[PDB]
Amino acid sequence: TTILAVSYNGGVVLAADSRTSSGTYVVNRASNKLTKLTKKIYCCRSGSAADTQALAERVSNYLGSYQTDIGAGVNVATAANLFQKMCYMNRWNISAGIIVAGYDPINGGSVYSIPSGGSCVKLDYALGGSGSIFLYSFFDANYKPGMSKSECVAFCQRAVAHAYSRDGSSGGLIRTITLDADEPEDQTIPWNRSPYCMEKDPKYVTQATQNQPFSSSAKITGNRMSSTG
Amino acid sequence: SGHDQSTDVFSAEGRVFQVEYAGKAVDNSSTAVAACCKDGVVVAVEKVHTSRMLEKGSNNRIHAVDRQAGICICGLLPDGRAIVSRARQEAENSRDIFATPIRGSVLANRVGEFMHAYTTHFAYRPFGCSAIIASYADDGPQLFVSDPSGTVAGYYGVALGKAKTVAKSELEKLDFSSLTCDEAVGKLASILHEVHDKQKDKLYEVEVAWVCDKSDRKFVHVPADMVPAE
Predict the structure, then answer these.
(1) Using CA atoms, how far apart are residues A41 and A185, in angstroms rounded to an integer?
(2) Which one of B65, B67, B142 makes the best mutation probe of the A interface by having the most chain A beta carbons within 10 Å?
(3) SS3 B173
(4) Could you tell me what percentage of chain B is helix, strand and coil, using 3-state DSSP and rounding each to the nearest 5?
(5) Nearest to A10 by CA among A142, A140, A186, A150
(6) Does B49 lie at the interface with A, CB-CB under 8 angstroms?
(7) Are A131 and A169 in contact (CB under 8 A)?
(8) DSSP letter for each residue of B80-143
(9) Is residue A186 part of a domain?
(10) Would you give the DSSP letter of residue B150?
């Protein structure tokens, strides 16, 4: 699982892979890990699918009633607090890493990370899942804060592609959603149109020289791909 | 007296007589010649048959040790087979421990060390054969000779056996700088045919092998229709 959220000037972009895997077999290759909480607030879920689904459904139910009670919109901080409380009271029984990202008219675009421990950190960008470990040095080198909306979406897709190119537990479709003062817009790009994979990378085209032909010299001359040669 | 019964005994003049007797046994064997042609090594031996009913290829004296290395035996054939087995063990050790073909000089040194160890202990006798090592390794074409005494020497052209001096004199007429393996095969076969006495060894065959660029640097026997008839 690879999930991330990046804030730009207007709002936020949430990116995720689509792969639910039972260890080494792909149970689902078209999952949707970007779960709607309110109209402008979403969460990226990593870990136990049942636990994260139940947490998101309960938080969405709580937030929907709260809008009717107060008669106004909900800030991203409220949803972040709801997840933080619910994950902290159940931290020993659930396996969940949550990213709460959204737009509210008061604080603009917000991104919150709630790891397995149950804390809540407000960040410019957040990463999560097994494939997030591959992206940290990718963000330290290639990520510049202050990108445009389209630039942020493209960077998020490229980061997700780079993450699941190396992570066996991640892969499949790349799903992104943009949340800002305008209408939220989703996008799903397939693997065959992904911004990066090692199969299309020209520097991994040449195979490692492992199957030496039987030769009278120590000179390495490529792999043996023929019985006669 | 008792000064020549075992190899662990020096003579009064500093000689090991058992090794000399083994060398004498080598000197009574069939003639072999070899040439390093600056692009490969060609070895040619004569096989004397005591029966006319022998299958073709019987009593092979040239054996491949590695892909690029081979050994010709001049002398007691079973001792040469033991030496060939030791050389094959040495060659595969290099390919398994060091992942590289064994250099011709290294293989020759190993063969010489193996043959020398049997000239120092009372419980063993020296090998009664000389070994001609022909290699085409990363150190270029190499031709070495290992003496029953265990001393190894590199040659451009070498002759061993009963008809050794005349074969060596014929080899002295070659250039070895413009000489190529294609013509060297014929030259060695002609020398062996000319130097051999036809009234004492009625059944004789010429067995020629080589390793140069034409065989992809692989030690093999010649094509059958390449050596001269006589």
Answers:
(1) 12
(2) B67
(3) coil
(4) 35, 25, 40
(5) A150
(6) no
(7) yes
(8) HHHHHHHHHHHHHHHHHHSSSPPPHHHHHHHHHHHHHGGGS-TT----SEEEEEEEEETTEEEE
(9) yes
(10) S
**The two three-digit tokens of residue B116, written as one number:** 């020398």
Buried b (16+ CB within 10 A) or exposed e, B137-175: bbeebbbbbbbbbbebeebbbbbbbbbbeebbebbeebe
Asked if A214's CB is within 8 angstroms of B101's CB, the reply is no
Q: Which residues pair with A13 in a beta bridge?
A: A6, A178
What is the domain range of residue A69? Answer: 3-204
d(CA A16, CA A31) in angstroms, rounded, equals: 9
Q: Is residue A216 part of a domain?
A: no
Q: Which residues of A are catalytic?
A: 1
For residues B128 and B146, give the distance between their C-alpha atoms in angstroms, rounded to a whole number: 11
A214 touches chain B (CB under 8 A): yes
Across the interface, whether the CB atoms of A216 and B100 are under 8 A apart is answered no
Q: Secondary structure of A13-40 in the HEC alphabet?
A: EEEEECCEEECCEEEECCCCCEEECCCC
Domain tally, chain A = 1
Provide the pairing of β-strand A174-179 with A12-17: antiparallel
E strand intervals along chain A? 3-7, 12-17, 20-22, 25-28, 34-36, 41-47, 96-104, 108-114, 121-123, 125-128, 174-179, 185-189
Indicate the resolution in Å.
2.7
Asked if A18 and A29 touch (Cβ cutoff 8 Å), the reply is: yes
Q: Look at residue A67 and tell me if it is in a domain.
A: yes
Look at residue A218 and tell me if it is in a domain. Answer: no
Distance, in Å, from the CA atom of A47 to the CA atom of A22, rounded to the nearest integer, reads: 11
Q: Which of A103, A38, A105 is nearest to A68 (CA)?
A: A38
Residue A166, domain CATH: 3.60.20.10
Query: Is A218 in Cβ contact with B101 (below 8 Å)?
Result: yes
Inter-helix orientation angle B104-116/B77-97, to 10°:
130
Comparing C-alpha atoms, which of A165, A136, A189 is closest to residue A4? A136
What is residue A213's DSSP assignment?
P
Q: Are A76 and A112 in contact (CB under 8 A)?
A: yes
Considering only CA atoms, which of B182, B137, B128, B178 is closest in space to residue B156? B178
